[PDB]
Ligand binder design. Structure first.
Ligand code: ZN
Lengths: 70, 191, 286, 282, 83
């Protein structure tokens, strides 16, 4: 059931998200990102992402409506 | 106006390649196709026409269709070469008409047999009762040497419409391109 | 040559529905339709298929019907709706292909360069891979066959696509499945493999006893070719082959040994980790 | 005459014909007909699905009559029950014109059904399928469904927000859908990912196998190198600041189990098949 | 004149598109593009765009709503030049 759980989360992306950049994280599973839309935001993250992919403002994707690090 | 599905059995065997008819059996049976297609056309456009040969690999050149221009396109370069085959001709004309989209049409068949046949009377009675099951009344107009006085064909017909059926008929093949409008003067609707 | 084909899961269901269509006759009505595929490569792709009216008697299997009209119109519709799709061959629901089956290919080799057959099995009692396809050739023989013509086995597989995997695999939730089951799918693999071995042996011995005595043709078809199968039969236990095993098996045993070695210690960490938190939270709780 | 707790019976081919059509026409609303059978006043059943050309206004219905005809003569005749199209990446909600075909259709057949599909929001685990049923506005105050059972009320799901922002109850009513599975297709659908005995009897290779183990052991050595420093390190920092400074490039104790698992599952089967190939053979 | 009226009838229902450039191909159907006026997006072609022609730096036309690549076009027109 857990492995069925991971896959069903995948519908969130569907491609057209946004190209933004990771900036910083406050705490566990919540960080800050400055989008290429000129503005900056405070957002949550998915538990699926590996935390070794961070550091020096990586290229990231975000939801159009939600604007969450996916 | 009656609903039926005409299935013609042309003869592109070798023995059609002669001149007991005035020009040629090809033109003779071809013209008889001309009168049968116009006949069913003027009877009912809902009716449909499909043709078959009697060669080694008896061919559905035209699936059962109301249009006749396709059949006329098929009549040309018919290549009457090979050997007359009968028992598989009535068979390929037999199992074919169960593929009909319209079922109100009565399964009719006309055959142009102009080569010496080698059938058996038990074969014509088995095929005859098999044609009793579906009641496929077939009227064959023979064009050339067919058999000894069209033997095994009036027996086939009578064993088809036995016990006063009189639906199928057998024509003759000794003089020439019989005007089938004259052959069906009384049997114009049902030969 | 084509040498393999990739059939999608849509077909093999778009045939089952039509076998269900005329499936009311029950006794026998062989389902025949049109196969649609792609001129992909030497390898060939199969995507679409559709049906066509077809009947055939019991005796003298030379009386069969494929509506060329229906084929022309319906494929005209499927080209109007998909020029990317095109005719590639044909199929029939026969569990075992019939002697008549060559005349059909030989008929519709004029539409496709070779209208490859497709045998499907509605009831594959064998738990192996069903729905295998053939392509006919000529193999004129020393006997003096004017045209030794017979189909050819061609390997095939099941196609896949992003969307269809989505919809199908969402349908697979009706039953349980362990596809991520570690070191389980392998065991199942050797199981079903050995099952296929035993099935093939029982079949070939069924044929072999029949031909051996009483009534069967004793042709030179296989009789020595399968003997050459006996020719290989590697004599496993011999002199240096022992050095083949013991010089590698212990190698992999060493790696497994190390893996267990670290696995034990890693398991041992959590004992300290939880034995600390339990009593340290207890003594502070009281 | 009154509504009920209706059920949408399907055909397994219908689903695939949906998703392949919509996916192929992903950048726009793809339209098609839903063909099935009116089993009763309570449930519906769809068995056949097909679409037509569109450059959403369908072109010549000469395709229609000939299509249904040739579908009747081959197979059998059936009944048109509803229809479908795509809302690509949308809220799977009946668009303004989508409802505009609905007074057209329900006026033709009573239980005309709209079918919304999105091959975009559907992940390989689960598909986002949908279908709706127009409701009158003249009875906006009067009751529309008798609600004589929990199934289409407190037993199904919950209306989504992006489609409730359009109708949610209004101009239509949702409907439940299930899957009927023939045993014939069920059995073959059960088995489509297995192989022949060749696969279960392969011995991959010991040169690239031993090469592979020689690979993984190498970096696994380094994983132990990091693991020593990390485990002994232990800043007294509370069990969550470690969980905030571990995001970064930190990963002991994670790859360590992984490489051990893979090195296990490789060597095990690799030995086993070689075992069987000699016990069984000769 | 009725023919002209029908012409405008057909002309009514045509919606424009967004113009952008192709940054890089992430996957066979995942692409990284940028609007000419600012931010960037992840998109996909339709089925048959001949994606081989799409290269980093080319220009393409995107769907307004679905936001996907339609009709990649030649270079631009620099209005300090045509004059
Ligand atoms: Zn819509």
């Amino acid at each position: 059931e857990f492995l069925h759980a991971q896959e069903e989360v995948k519908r969130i992306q569907s491609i057209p998200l946004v190209i933004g950049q990771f900036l910083e994280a406050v705490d566990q599973n919540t960080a800050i990102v400055g989008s290429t839309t000129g503005s900056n935001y405070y957002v949550r993250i998915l538990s699926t992402i590996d935390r070794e992919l961070l550091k020096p403002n990586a290229s990231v994707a975000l939801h159009k409506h939600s604007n969450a690090l996916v | 106006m009656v609903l039926e599905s005409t299935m013609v059995c042309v003869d592109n065997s070798e023995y059609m390649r002669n001149g007991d008819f005035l020009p040629t059996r090809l033109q003779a049976q071809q013209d008889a196709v001309n009168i049968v297609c116009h006949s069913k056309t003027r009877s009912n456009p809902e009716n449909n026409v499909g043709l078959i040969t009697l060669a080694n690999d008896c061919e559905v050149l035209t699936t059962l269709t109301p249009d006749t221009g396709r059949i006329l396109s098929k009549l040309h370069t018919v290549q009457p070469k090979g050997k007359i085959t009968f028992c598989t001709g009535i068979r390929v004309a037999h199992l074919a008409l169960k593929h009909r989209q319209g079922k109100n049409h009565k399964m009719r068949i006309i055959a142009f047999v102009g080569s010496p046949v080698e059938d058996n009377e038990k074969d014509l009675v088995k095929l005859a009762k098999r044609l009793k099951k579906e009641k496929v009344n077939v009227d064959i107009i023979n064009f050339g040497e067919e058999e000894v006085n069209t033997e095994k064909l009036t027996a086939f017909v009578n064993t088809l419409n036995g016990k006063d059926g009189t639906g199928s008929h057998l024509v003759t093949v000794p003089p020439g391109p019989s005007l089938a409008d004259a052959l069906i003067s009384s049997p114009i609707l049902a030969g | 040559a084509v040498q393999k084909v990739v059939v999608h899961p849509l077909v093999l269901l778009s045939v089952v529905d039509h076998f269900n269509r005329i499936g009311k006759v029950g006794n026998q009505k062989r389902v025949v339709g049109v196969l649609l595929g792609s001129w992909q490569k030497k390898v060939l792709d199969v995507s679409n298929s559709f049906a066509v009216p077809f009947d055939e008697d019991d005796k003298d299997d030379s009386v069969w019907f494929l509506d060329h009209d229906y084929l022309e119109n319906m494929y005209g519709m499927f080209k109007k709706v998909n020029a990317r799709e095109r005719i590639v061959g044909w199929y029939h629901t026969g569990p075992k292909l019939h002697k008549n089956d060559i005349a059909i290919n030989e008929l519709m080799k004029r539409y496709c360069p070779n209208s490859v057959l497709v045998i499907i099995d509605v009831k594959p009692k064998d738990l192996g891979l069903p729905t295998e396809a053939y392509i006919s050739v000529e193999e004129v023989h020393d006997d003096g066959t004017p045209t030794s013509k017979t189909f050819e086995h061609v390997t095939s597989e099941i196609g896949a696509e992003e969307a269809e995997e989505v919809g199908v695999e969402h349908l697979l939730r009706d039953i349980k499945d362990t596809t991520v089951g570690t070191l389980s799918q392998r065991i199942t693999n050797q199981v079903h493999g050995l099952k296929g071995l035993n099935s093939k042996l029982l079949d070939i011995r069924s044929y072999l006893e029949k031909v051996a005595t009483g009534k069967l043709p004793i042709n030179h078809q296989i009789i020595y070719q399968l003997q050459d199968v006996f020719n290989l039969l590697p004599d496993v236990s011999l002199q240096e082959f022992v050095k083949a095993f013991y010089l590698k098996t212990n190698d992999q045993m060493v790696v497994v040994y190390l893996a267990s070695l670290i696995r034990s210690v890693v398991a041992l960490h959590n004992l300290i980790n939880n034995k600390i938190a339990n009593r340290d939270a207890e003594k502070k709780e009281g | 005459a009154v509504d009920t707790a209706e059920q949408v019976y399907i055909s397994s081919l219908a689903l695939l014909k949906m998703l392949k059509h919509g996916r192929a026409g992903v950048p726009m609303e793809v339209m098609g007909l839903m063909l099935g059978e009116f089993v009763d006043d309570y449930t519906v059943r769809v068995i056949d699905v097909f679409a037509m050309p569109q450059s959403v206004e369908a072109v010549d219905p000469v395709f229609q009559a000939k299509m249904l005809d040739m579908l009747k003569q081959t197979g059998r005749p059936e009944m048109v029950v509803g229809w479908y199209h795509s809302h690509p990446g949308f809220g799977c909600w009946l668009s303004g014109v989508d409802i505009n075909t609905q007074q057209s259709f329900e006026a033709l057949s009573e239980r005309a059904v709209a079918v919304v599909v999105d091959p975009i929001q559907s992940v390989k685990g689960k598909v986002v399928i949908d279908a709706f049923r127009l409701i009158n506005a003249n009875m906006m105050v009067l009751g529309h469904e008798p609600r004589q059972t929990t199934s289409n009320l407190g037993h199904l799901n919950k209306p989504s927000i992006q489609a409730l922002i359009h109708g949610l109850n209004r101009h239509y009513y949702s409907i439940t859908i299930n899957y009927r599975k023939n045993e014939l297709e069920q059995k073959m659908l059960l088995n489509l990912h297995k192989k022949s005995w060749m696969e279960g009897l392969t011995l991959q290779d010991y040169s690239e196998h031993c090469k592979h183990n020689e690979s993984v052991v190498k970096e696994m050595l380094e994983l132990a190198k990091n693991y020593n420093k990390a485990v002994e390190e232990e800043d007294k920092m509370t069990p969550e600041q470690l969980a905030i400074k571990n995001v970064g490039k930190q990963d002991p104790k994670r790859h360590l189990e992984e490489h051990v698992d893979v090195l296990m599952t490789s060597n095990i089967v690799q030995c086993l098949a070689a075992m069987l190939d000699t016990v069984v053979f000769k | 004149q009725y023919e002209k009226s029908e012409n405008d009838l057909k002309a009514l229902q045509s919606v424009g598109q967004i113009v952008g450039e192709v940054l890089k191909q992430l996957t066979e159907e995942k692409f990284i593009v940028k609007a000419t006026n600012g931010p960037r997006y992840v998109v996909g072609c339709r089925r048959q765009l001949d994606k081989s022609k799409l290269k980093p730096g080319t220009r393409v036309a995107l769907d307004m709503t679905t936001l996907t690549i339609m009709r990649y076009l030649p270079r631009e027109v620099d209005p300090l030049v045509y004059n």
